[PDB]
Copies of this chain bind each other. A is one copy, B any other.
Amino acid sequence: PQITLWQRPIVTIKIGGQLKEALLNTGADDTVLEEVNLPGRWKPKLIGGIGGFVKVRQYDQVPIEICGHKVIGTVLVGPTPANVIGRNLMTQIGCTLNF
């Protein structure tokens, strides 16, 4: 797709057998989603940092689908004010900024 930016670029993702909404966020290094159950091994990761860090679970090589594009990448699962698709998954779907 071509997504303009007059509104927040919220898209549907498919992951963990669920449909979720998440913000395409070029200001986010990583993808962080709340309330998804992913299988298998994970490792703790500290994110944030201003005022302290938040611990999340890092899952690697997770299959996820974003607007018809099936890709694989790291998903952080943990509390987040809003679900976020970061640059790590945008590179996998071939998402660019253009002007």
Contact = CB atoms under 8 A, between A and B. Distances in A.
A25 B27 contact: yes
A16 interface: no
Query: Which of A67, A84, A96 has the largest count of B CB atoms less than 10 A from its CB?
Result: A96
State how many copies of this chain the complex holds.
2
Majority secondary structure of chain A interface residues (helix, strand, loop or mixed): loop
B99 A94 contact: yes
Interface residues of A, number: 31
Contacts of A3: 96-98
Given A8-B87, A81-B50, A87-B8, A98 B2 contact: yes
A23 interface: yes
Interface string A10-52: 0000000000000111111100000000000000000000110
Interface of A: 1-6, 8-9, 23-29, 50-51, 67, 69, 81, 84, 87, 90-91, 93-99
